Structure formats: C-alpha cells, structure tokens
Design an enzyme around this catalytic site. Structure first.
Site, mmCIF file in Angstrom:
data_model
loop_
_atom_site.group_PDB
_atom_site.id
_atom_site.type_symbol
_atom_site.label_atom_id
_atom_site.label_comp_id
_atom_site.label_asym_id
_atom_site.label_seq_id
_atom_site.Cartn_x
_atom_site.Cartn_y
_atom_site.Cartn_z
ATOM 1 N N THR A 160 0.744 -1.381 0.112
ATOM 2 C CA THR A 160 0.166 -0.286 0.040
ATOM 3 C C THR A 160 1.067 1.199 -0.414
ATOM 4 O O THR A 160 0.074 2.380 -0.677
ATOM 5 C CB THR A 160 -0.394 0.445 1.021
ATOM 6 O OG1 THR A 160 -1.810 -0.921 1.114
ATOM 7 C CG2 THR A 160 -1.734 1.172 1.267
ATOM 8 N N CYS A 161 1.857 1.267 0.828
ATOM 9 C CA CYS A 161 2.832 1.898 0.955
ATOM 10 C C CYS A 161 3.313 2.419 -0.940
ATOM 11 O O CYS A 161 4.282 4.163 -0.986
ATOM 12 C CB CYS A 161 3.931 2.048 1.565
ATOM 13 S SG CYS A 161 3.611 1.915 3.585
ATOM 14 N N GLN A 162 3.114 1.525 -1.055
ATOM 15 C CA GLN A 162 4.264 1.433 -2.733
ATOM 16 C C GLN A 162 3.225 2.246 -3.308
ATOM 17 O O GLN A 162 2.902 3.111 -4.172
ATOM 18 C CB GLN A 162 5.352 0.374 -2.575
ATOM 19 C CG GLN A 162 5.473 0.510 -4.363
ATOM 20 C CD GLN A 162 6.333 1.709 -4.657
ATOM 21 O OE1 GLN A 162 6.341 2.171 -3.983
ATOM 22 N NE2 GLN A 162 5.812 2.109 -6.125
#
Ligand SMILES: [Zn+2]
Ligand SMILES: [Zn+2]
Ligand SMILES: [Zn+2]
Ligand SMILES: [Zn+2]
Ligand SMILES: [Zn+2]
Ligand SMILES: [Zn+2]
Ligand SMILES: [Zn+2]
Ligand SMILES: [Zn+2]
Ligand SMILES: [Zn+2]
Ligand SMILES: [Zn+2]
Ligand SMILES: [Zn+2]
Ligand SMILES: [Zn+2]
Ligand SMILES: [Zn+2]
Lengths: 103, 171, 172, 104
Positions: free
Chosen positions: B61-63
C-alpha cells in the site's frame, strides 16, 4: 402482492438507520414500469424511506450506491449474481458493508 | 517520550530532524550515497511544504497507492504552490534512497528521508512498534494547516495526494 | 545465548520471513512474505548463511553481497546447495535488495531475521541489527561460524573465507 | 644498476589488505624486465605479488589490471592527468591507492 426480505447494514452504515443493522421490509414485486423489482429499486427505496440521516450522499450518490460499500446477496458478492439488476426473490438477504479497505 | 498532537494552527515543532541521502541524479540502487541531516524545522519555516509519513518502504500500500499518487500529480502540486514534498518513514536513509530511486525520483521534487526511531512521529502521536503511521502534514511559513492520519490499513483517504490537493485549494 | 561454534548442531526452531522469488526484477511489485524454516532446510546438504547489518548500505552492498554474487559458479562447484542472506530489514526490503542485485531465482535467497531473534540467540546482534557474520552448515552440523567485528571488514564473513573453509570438506 | 625510492599509501579500505598499514616504503628497479623506465603498471604488479598480506588479490588487481573503483593519486594528482599505468615513476614519488567502494 408484496415480497418479504431482510436488509442488513454494517461497517458504519447502521448508524444511518437508528444504529440498527437488520431490517425486515416488504417491497412491491413490480416497479412503476411494472417490471420485476430489482436491487436498484431497493437501493432507491432505502435512501428515500429508511434512512434517518438527511445526508443521502452517505448511502446513494447520483442515483447509484456510494462507492466503498460491499453488497452481498445471500452472502454472495452481487458482482457474481448481477449488479443492480438481480431480480429480488423472497426471503432474500441484502447486506451492505461500508469499508475503507480496497482503495 | 513526550507526546502532543500536531493540529492545524500550530507552529511546526522545532528540533525536527531527519536522516537522508540527497538526490544526485542517479537511479542506480547498488550505489548508495552518504546520509546527512535534514533540518525539517528550518526548511518548513518558509513556503508551502507537504510532509507525508508511511509505515514501510517497499510495502504494497505504501508503494502501489500512496507514493505513486503523489508522483503522478507533482505537476498539480507544483501548480498549487507546493515548494517541497517530503516522504518519511522509520526505514533508514539508505533504504529510503533506494525506494525513491525505485520510483524514478532523481531530483528534489520528492525527498525520501528517515524519521529515525520514529522520534518525530512518536512526538505527535502517530507511530507504533518502530514504524511511523500513515499521515500527511501540510505546512505554510512555519504554521501547520492540515495534519491527518489514516488509521485503517490500506486507506489513503486522509493522507493521500487528493486529500492534500483539496486542502490546498481552500485558501 | 552462547557463541555458535564449528562442530555444533545448527539450532532448532530458526525461522526467517521472506518473499519467495517470482522471477521479477520489478522493485515496485511486492509479493507476500511467508515463513522459511532454516533449521529444516539446513538439516540436509551444505548451506551458506550470511548476515549483514543493513540492506542497501554501502559495505554490505558494494563488498559483501557483491562478492558472493561474483562467485556463485565457484560456490556451486564447491557443492553449496543453497545461499541465504539475512538482515533485520523486513521481508519486503530484503526482496527489493535481492532484485536490485539482479537475483531473480533461488541462487541467493533474501530473508529477514525478524527482531534479530536468531542473531541475538547466538550473540551476534545489536541495536536492532544483525552482525556481519557467515555460517556454513553441512547436514545439520555447523562447520564454520565467524563474525567480522572490525568496521567495514569482510575478512571472516566474506565469500573467500567461505570458499576456503569449504575446500576442507567434500559433499553436495 | 640503480633503484628508485617511493612511498605508497593505501586508503578507503585497501589498507585492510596490508594488515591495516597505510604507508609503505619501496625501492623499485629503475628499469623493468624489458629495460624500459619503470612505470605504475610495474608498481601495481609488484604490490599484488610482494606486498599484500591478504590472499584476496582480486580486491586490488583483476585480470592483470588494477581493480576498478580505485583512485590513483600521484603526489596528490589523479593519474589520469599524468598518464595511467605508463607514468614513469620519479624518485620520492608518493602514490596513493584509495578505494571508492566502502569497506574493502
Ligand atoms: Zn449503480
Ligand atoms: Zn559514504
Ligand atoms: Zn511558492
Ligand atoms: Zn558452544
Ligand atoms: Zn515499477
Ligand atoms: Zn528496512
Ligand atoms: Zn594483523
Ligand atoms: Zn610493507
Ligand atoms: Zn597528500
Ligand atoms: Zn577514469
Ligand atoms: Zn599534472
Ligand atoms: Zn587510458
Ligand atoms: Zn598521502
């Protein structure tokens, strides 16, 4: 005749209905056009006759259900059983769950 | 440590420092630079800033959602007056530098820094178990204008790019 | 805690978290981490386990893992059945480090010693990071276990040290 | 039959190949094996065979040439400016080998 169903609201949607999850409602088996009742009619019915919160933005947006709400028909995602077109049948459960997941 | 929520209308906290490797223009992940200190308190003291925190570099998700959104709309952030975009995480400065490169960032458009031991994030109440929370802090001439955290895993509703753009257009 | 020494049996219940290689070198696409039972894998065959303080750091990158990557053919020729690289970095970061080095297959696996649980149990960890060490195992029994304490040195944990100790044994 | 005295320095982690001793004194043959003035190429060769105390020669010389990632400074001057490997060593020259790679 009318048709009997149960609608459930979870994931925060219940708060729009006196914080009540389960509701039993009897629909007209036919619409104004006279065609068999569908989920689309149901969604429109809930927004106009069951919501106790005046902000209808929070459930239906521009005549369709707000994004981020899962719709399960007898525990089956409505994408597998026809979307907004599933012809409602007796003792059918429709579950609406709002999720911030899936973005 | 000590914790105090960081809320709109506050002065951005002093003594806020991150560790980072300045962008040299390379996209080679096998050649690492030299970490130095970034004085966030001084940099944010003039001009519009966008400080975004993420739990973990190179995670899904961070990416695939959060950083990709900001990269996709840098032109729109520039047009809105944003002078600098900072992305921080508990990851060390080397991993952060490799993450930025992995996203094609070779310049200062977005800086990738490390909030070492979640020192800053913990001071504002948005960290846990050695990782920062997913939040976004818009700052303007030293004063905070917006500071919201996404609590549900996967959600970028409050800390995502579109949230920041909406906040910028209301001034 | 006690130093792990040659002639010892490799400890039991040693598990690492890692993303199995899929064949991709795309750093932006993460797989799904799973458990690796190091104790079971090392129980048969010759294994080389290398720990590094930090993924994407200079010496760990430019010297240590590069040295092993340069001499897989020599390691294979020596009978090595598997090469493992661990660090405190999470399984996502380790997988990106492996990809950054062009490793698409199982030739070298990149795994996470979460919370330095294994490294701490053998006394080679500090401040949330593993030490720089290398363990060689043969059918469950440790045949070499050395840590590089001098800053920047790969003398004891580098590829060449592992190749030399391997030459004092014969098996695949 | 005269010799040339020089000092060679190892830095950037290269010193770890010479038991961590940075500075070394060498007296070279002023003429090489073909009778021409001795050069840095001869020096690099000499260091790898007679001065290293570590068995990892590839950390200094690879395929008969200096390993890449090593700067060579001749009296503080980059050997690219003075001619690399062909520079004829002068008396009391200081040659500095420094690795740009971290560690070894
Ligand atoms: Zn619809
Ligand atoms: Zn450096
Ligand atoms: Zn401006
Ligand atoms: Zn013992
Ligand atoms: Zn990509
Ligand atoms: Zn990491
Ligand atoms: Zn010594
Ligand atoms: Zn000497
Ligand atoms: Zn000098
Ligand atoms: Zn050159
Ligand atoms: Zn000159
Ligand atoms: Zn040339
Ligand atoms: Zn000098």
């Amino acid at each position: 005749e009318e048709i009997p169903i149960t609608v459930d609201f979870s994931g925060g949607l219940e708060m729009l209905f006196d914080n009540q999850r389960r509701h039993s409602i009897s629909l007209p088996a036919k619409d104004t056009e006279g065609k068999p009742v569908t989920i689309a009619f149901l969604i429109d019915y809930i927004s106009k006759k069951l919501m106790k919160d005046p902000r209808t933005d929070l459930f239906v947006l521009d005549n369709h259900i707000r994004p981020g709400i899962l719709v399960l028909i007898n525990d089956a995602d409505w994408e597998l059983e026809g979307e907004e077109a599933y012809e409602i049948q007796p003792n059918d459960n429709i579950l609406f769950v709002s999720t911030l997941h899936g973005g | 440590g000590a914790m105090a929520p960081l809320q709109p209308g506050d002065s951005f906290p002093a003594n806020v420092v991150f560790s980072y490797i300045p962008p040299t223009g390379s996209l080679d992940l096998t050649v690492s630079g030299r970490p130095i200190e970034y004085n966030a308190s001084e940099a944010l003291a003039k001009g519009t800033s966008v400080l975004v925190a993420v739990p973990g570099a190179f995670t899904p998700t961070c990416q695939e959602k959060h950083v990709t959104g900001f990269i996709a709309k840098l032109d729109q952030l520039r047009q809105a007056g944003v002078d600098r975009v900072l992305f921080i995480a508990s990851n060390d400065a080397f991993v952060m530098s490799a993450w930025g490169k992995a996203n094609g960032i070779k310049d200062e458009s977005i800086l990738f820094l490390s909030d070492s031991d979640t020192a800053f994030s913990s001071s504002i109440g948005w960290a846990n178990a050695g990782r920062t929370g997913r939040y976004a802090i818009v700052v303007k001439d030293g004063k905070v204008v917006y500071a919201a955290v996404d609590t549900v895993r996967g959600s970028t509703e409050k800390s995502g790019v579109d949230a920041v753009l909406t906040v910028l257009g209301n001034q």
